[PDB]
Symmetry: C5
Subunit: 248 residues, 5 copies
């Protein structure tokens, strides 16, 4: 009894300044969403000959780890809440902190050697997963953002009816799996994925490219500039509309 | 001792059927979005599954589909006849044919508007081009397989589907937890969707999405997937309404009012 | 509080109004037929999969039926036996066995009619219907002793499932504790009489009323399923299996 | 302490563990082209039924619990339970044989039994004892975790992983073998010539399947193993 | 609401604690983590032709048995969740104290792992699946032997981050269901991704060394390899190329949950 509800009241929201503590909960969320994406990449590595949809579904289930970590630990994920029924200066704080968390996990994943796993296939999986996010028209990217954050917010929202750990965790699997297998776009998730792809594209050894049968040229859209303009901006706009789409 | 909370069932029915303004219309739009989500999930999971055993691919897609009903029940959105013995029974005293009309018509038309908005939003997303067009093709095929039933067939598949949705919601009521309410619905929903039973609201998403793809897909899409608009000739607004929506909706009504016209053969004092 | 454990009180059962027992039994027939429909869906096209794996998945799906029975309080033939030791007569307890049994049959056959009207058998280029034909025909070749024993085996499982469900406090407890025992008996091909009242009639109806186009698509003929007849169903399956179920549900000892 | 509650609950447990094994055989029939570990793992999940049955229904399975029944005179009804378990297992062997199941999946079901049983017959005595320790450690751990359980969910599902581990890994449980090897012997000795043609083997190919070999090569060392395994 | 006080005190308690109840419990944890890795090897034997990620994912789910066993039974696993002892030997507990028992648990974990190695070896298990089980152990162990020091430290950080988060979430658990199942995903994630846990490695690499050194000629012919093909499997190489940098990594990884919170 009691120990459990102690740990999860300390997980929750909406004292505005002190930030810093908010900035640190948001770094935490960036690390959790980065975990989700690494899990996804691990599970879908080598699944090129499975049925498309089945691979993606399993990657999706695995990814829900990230959001579970955010809700049970009480980290602060950009616009993931909006069970704020009783703003934007605070959003900037969370966003920038999400970003730092994600970039810290990129650095750590890079230092681990993991791109070489499965004879380079893990790294190529990152290269292709990131590259596929790079070819949307602006309207597409905004719409895929709308869809992703819709699902994240509904997941979080259901979580509240939760009484047990089981309830709060597992009610989030299906909607999270749904957006991730469907390839909807979440901006914070992308702050890990596309950077991770950029780092791999720029610092992979000649050996890696031989092993995987590609070259850094095959991935010409993975650049910080292109990332910001072609993905991050229109996706982020899309996530805002997405999380807002419900309220109205 | 006899607990005859048909009363509570009816009383619930009277509020839902006549009360709050467009709260209902707005909740029904929300349910249309949720059932759209469910079918999008089914398409994603089953994209590229052509070579898997038929049943397995369908069984998986059906589990995924259950998200939609989970969404509806847990968030309190309004899904046409689904389940609501509430409203149907609950006319058995307290409600006039005219009010039922107003309401079923209100929820239906809202369910549709949600569905059509998600159609428009999926189409703007570019999703049809996913997996080298195989996502799109999957929608075309799924929609087309809903287009060749006789009238009797389509009514029956509709009875079967809505029986399942209603048993799912009915079992939900015994739910004590979130875990309880959500997961008790997985098996009966998966059953209806894997066996290709027909639900009108789900089809308000699926068939229009098929029509939209057929009419607006680029030549690049058709070359990629090896097909043509002509290969799905039945996907038209007119065919949808007369060969699917009409008979399937009739079927759904027979199928969900059955559960009650039946709680009764087991109440009558 | 959370009263709607008024729903689970709304269930129960012993000493009776007769026609209200007949309706819950129809209900149970409908539920088990659903189970079997589910199974045939899941396993259609699974010819190439490893035998046991296809069977197991089919068995997990099947458990819907029993879940539907217990959580809804429908009346399934000799399924709550163990429970019913919680006034024993052999013309009174037997009087409603017959009532439930006959009720189960009506539900099953109403589901057979409805599935047939649905066109379902044409699903998967006729493989759904062929699945039904083959599933039923495999239950038609047992020697009398085999059938009784597959009957004991099957009902032993169903009774144990229902029994365990009693310890169940949540919907999760009650539904999920039955998935393993039910999956086991379905996937092992044990024989449940009521489930049979759906499957075999279903096969008969297909064998008899399928179009020529169906036989050509699936590459078989009504001659390849000569044991699918109402007379063979009753004598070679339903009788011995039912006997079997009875013994099965009653392994009480001293 | 009433000794015929005990002897009958033990029979009940032998029935449950035979059920467990049958389920496993069903699941794994035809799985020869599946990756080894995957088939075994699924087979192992299926098996957990038996122990779930034992715990929720309160049957009496030889030397688990025991981690709990320490919260030296024990051997008392160890003999009683053990002999009980055997009768349940052997009764199920008779019932399975009467059912015609060995002919399932064109004889593959039976051949699956012959092979699973034969694979238990080739251990050195030190091997059999050790797989015996490993098996019963897991059963006993499972049953111990079960007590923390508050719901039916808790008690049943906390046992799936540790049981699946022991079965998939091929550790040796004496009572489960009381079903599996007997079943194999019966099939070997009585299967019709149709069956041997169907599965393309012969009773010769399973020479070790005999009551005497069973006792000396598998039952005695695995039982010693389960007792040591149950206390650590 | 400072839980930092209760956890510190629970911290202080566990680090200071009844005699060799903690030694006993650490041996117990070494046995549990060995069980986890055995399960993983069983599940993934013969999975060479499955998609990489899928085999690893399934193996990872199976592995989670170990941590479940640890948490539900209360065994003592090195630095987690010593989220306690460490995080909140800011205050009480000396360097002399936090060492006295990290060292106690660590050495206990090792003894448990090594006892399980001996018992697995005596069981004959390496011959399972026509030697593929043993080959699976050889390969799994060998893949942990080719990291640069910085790589091994980082894989250590990653692994113990996940173990600590798993155990941390477990605290919110009210049921057996809650506590056990909330750990499946984070443990599966680390194991499938090949992150490095020191105690798990105290089973896996010794197991590999034992197989390499004592396998019969029949085993090598069956699996089509030789002891030479696994030249890095030695006690010396284990210690310097894996155990040291991974352990350093695990400490940073779990302690990083100190600095966190504040």
């Amino acid at each position: 009894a009691a120990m459990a509800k102690v740990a999860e009241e300390a997980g929750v929201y909406k004292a505005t300044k002190h930030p810093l503590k908010t900035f640190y909960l948001a770094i935490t969320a960036g690390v959790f969403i980065s975990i989700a994406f690494v899990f996804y990449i691990t599970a879908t590595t080598g699944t090129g000959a499975m049925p498309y949809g089945m691979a993606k579904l399993i990657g999706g289930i695995c990814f829900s780890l990230g959001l579970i970590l955010c809700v049970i630990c009480g980290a602060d994920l950009f616009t993931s809440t909006v069970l704020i029924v009783v703003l934007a200066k605070n959003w900037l704080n969370v966003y920038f902190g999400n970003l730092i968390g994600a970039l810290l996990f990129v650095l750590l994943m890079w230092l681990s050697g993991e791109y070489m796993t499965a004879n380079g296939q893990w790294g190529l999986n990152v290269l292709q997963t990131a590259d596929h996010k790079m070819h949307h028209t602006f309207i597409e990217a905004v719409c895929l953002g709308i869809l992703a954050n819709l699902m994240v917010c509904l997941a979080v929202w259901m979580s509240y009816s939760g009484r047990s750990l089981m309830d709060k965790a597992f009610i989030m699997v299906l909607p999270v799996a749904m957006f991730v297998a469907s390839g909807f776009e979440h901006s914070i998730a992308n702050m890990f994925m596309i950077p991770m792809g950029i780092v791999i594209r720029d610092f992979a050894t000649p050996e890696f490219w031989t092993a995987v049968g590609s070259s850094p040229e095959s991935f010409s859209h993975l650049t910080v500039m292109s990332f910001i303009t072609d993905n991050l901006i229109p996706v982020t706009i899309g996530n805002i509309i997405g999380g807002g789409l419900l309220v109205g």
